[PDB]
Amino acid sequence: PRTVMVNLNIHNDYYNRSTSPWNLHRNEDPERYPSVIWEAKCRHLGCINADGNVDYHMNSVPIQQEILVLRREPPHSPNSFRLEKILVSVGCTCVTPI
Amino acid sequence: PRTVMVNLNIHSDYYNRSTSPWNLHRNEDPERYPSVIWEAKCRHLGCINADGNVDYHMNSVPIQQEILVLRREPPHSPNSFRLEKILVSVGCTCVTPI
Numbered sequence: 197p198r199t200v201m202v203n204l205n206i207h208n209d210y211y212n213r214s215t216s217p218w219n220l221h222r223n224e225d226p227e228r229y230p231s232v233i234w235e236a237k238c239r240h241l242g243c244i245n246a247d248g249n250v251d252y253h254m255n256s257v258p259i260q261q262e263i264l265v266l267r268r269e270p271p272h273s274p275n276s277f278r279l280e281k282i283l284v285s286v287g288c289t290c291v292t293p294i
Numbered sequence: 295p296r297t298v299m300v301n302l303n304i305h306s307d308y309y310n311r312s313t314s315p316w317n318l319h320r321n322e323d324p325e326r327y328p329s330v331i332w333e334a335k336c337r338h339l340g341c342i343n344a345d346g347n348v349d350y351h352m353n354s355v356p357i358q359q360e361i362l363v364l365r366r367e368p369p370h371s372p373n374s375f376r377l378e379k380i381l382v383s384v385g386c387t388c389v390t391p392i
């Protein structure tokens with residue numbers, strides 16, 4: 197066990213023009229800290245071209261990143277957690293299919 | 295102070311095809327947990343077009359996300375931290391300039 201103390205009191209539209217734009221989706225888990233995680237969902241299957249139209253010869257893909265979260269241990273505990281890895285979507289990029 | 299206990303013991307080649315590709319940069323901070331954060335740096339100023347060439351009519355931009363990290367409190371403490379917000383580049387997207 198590597199138990200440390202953590203003080204949870206935190207110290208102190210641009211991407212709308214993307215060819216692979218995204219919206220935010222609320223992921224809520226009461227057994228986790230942070231309980232609310234905003235994930236990116238690509239608006240389209242294709243990428244928006246210069247004309248403002250969707251081109252399906254390319255794909256908008258979510259960028260999946262491993263992040264660390266705190267899991268309540270034992271369950272429902274207000275003050276004790278275990279570090280845990282989860283995969284979250286942090287944005288979208290445009291890719292040329294294989 | 296909202297002090298909790300945390301047990302720190304936990305129980306990419308597709309994005310190479312991006313029109314706004316990026317490389318990973320190691321961001322190391324001994325006063326922070328995680329000490330190592332992999333940050334995205336856009337490979338080009340422009341985006342890769344259908345011909346496979348870097349096209350400057352569009353821009354590769356880094357996607358910045360606010361990320362929570364643990365800051366050693368007091369400084370150099372091996373087992374006590376305070377939650378803190380930083381901005382991290384997690385990937386690149388292609389945008390149409392304004």
Ligand SMILES: COC[C@H](c1cnn2cc([C@@H](NC(=O)/C(F)=C\C3CC3)C3CCC(F)(F)CC3)nc2c1)N1C[C@@H](C(F)(F)F)NC1=O
Nearest residue numbers: 230232233234263264265266284285286359360361362363
């Ligand atoms: C300011 O709140 C932004 C929020 C968010 C959500 N969850 N979250 C997890 C982490 C961890 N840090 C990391 O995972 C980390 F530092 C680095 C890895 C490499 C990027 C922490 C957790 C607490 C800790 F006490 F466990 C120390 C670790 N921070 C965050 C930040 N966001 C951001 C955006 C998202 F998709 F990117 F998540 N959507 C969100 O909802």
